[PDB]
Design a binder for this molecule. Structure first.
Ligand SMILES: C=CCN(Cc1ccccc1C(=O)NCC1CCCCC1)Cc1ccc2c(c1C(=O)O)OC[C@H](CCC(=O)O)O2
Ligand SMILES: C=CCN(Cc1ccccc1C(=O)NCC1CCCCC1)Cc1ccc2c(c1C(=O)O)OC[C@H](CCC(=O)O)O2
Ligand SMILES: [Cl-]
Ligand SMILES: [Cl-]
Lengths: 149, 149
């Protein structure tokens, strides 16, 4: 549970926003990339796993599941690479809702930056700090600290 | 002190490696940039503060302390921007040691990637996971979780 992350790819302004969600907390990291490639996804996972104890990643699609560069990143970083099949149908809905929420926040901040990447990082900040009560940022730290102890 | 970070700028291969250190744990985030501008520093702080509860940042030099773009990022993200004067002389030594350690790790991984940015992220991973026995990644989570509780 503490180590499980899900990848998610959404599109805006002709660009791709790649998101990793910590399943148990709803905490996210995200970046803007010109297109989803194996190299972009691999580099993103490398960053993520240096920052959080990433044990398992549910990949966002079959191309990233297949990608030897993504497999190489997962090997390097000690991540178990898994598929992202929603065996629990509620999983689809959760990711869909999150993409809608993120896009809403990006709209609310869009005029506070020229570049989409800046707006996306503002959206990450707002998402992670939002109290729903604890924030996703608080939940992830508590979950992982409990695991360590 | 759970919320205190220090910026650090070091150079390699004609590029700049910008580092943020969580003082209490030694945990780091880092990125490669072409040069250390206010905008680059502002964007880096924006990313950091969306990911960790950044209360205070000791800036790495007077130019980043002065920069209105850096001040704007700190305002946006709710960060108290401070100078980085080593009133405690041991502070210089610690940062210098860390830069030396990071460069050593980058050397050890350098042939496992074409691009410096990839090597730097490998180095971040190795640094944060190294047991010294807890790792910096464990220490930061424990410190922050204790603060929330
Ligand atoms: C003088 C700065 C240029 N921008 C001025 C701006 C333009 C339009 C609207 C508002 C603002 C504005 O001042 N917003 C307030 C405020 C600025 C700090 C962050 C919190 C919000 C903002 C900015 C800063 C760093 C970036 C940006 C951008 C961008 O406009 O997107 O883009 C990506 C770039 C990547 C790093 C690199 O390449 O250096 O870092
Ligand atoms: C076919 C991939 C190209 N590289 C092949 C390579 C080249 C030379 C030596 C070893 C290896 C090698 O296979 N290493 C093993 C393994 C793969 C990387 C993760 C762990 C280590 C690796 C790589 C991947 C993603 C990147 C990279 C790089 C790079 O070479 O630096 O550079 C930045 C780029 C930014 C995102 C974007 O721009 O897409 O993401
Ligand atoms: Cl947070
Ligand atoms: Cl870690």
């Amino acid at each position: 549970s503490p180590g499980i992350w899900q990848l998610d790819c959404t599109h805006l302004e002709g660009k791709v926003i790649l998101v990793a969600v910590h399943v148990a907390s709803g905490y996210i990291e995200a970046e803007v990339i010109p297109a989803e490639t194996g190299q972009e996804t691999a580099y993103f996972l490398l960053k993520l796993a240096g920052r959080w104890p990433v044990k398992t990643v549910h990949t966002d699609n079959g191309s990233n599941f297949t990608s030897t560069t993504v497999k190489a990143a997962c090997w390097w970083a000690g991540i178990k690479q898994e598929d992202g099949i929603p065996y629990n149908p509620q999983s689809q809905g959760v990711i869909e809702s999150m993409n809608k929420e993120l896009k809403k926040i990006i709209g609310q901040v869009r005029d506070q930056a020229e570049h989409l990447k800046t707006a996306v990082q503002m959206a990450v900040f707002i998402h992670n700090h939002k109290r729903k009560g604890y924030s996703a940022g608080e939940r992830i730290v508590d979950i992982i600290a409990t695991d360590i102890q």
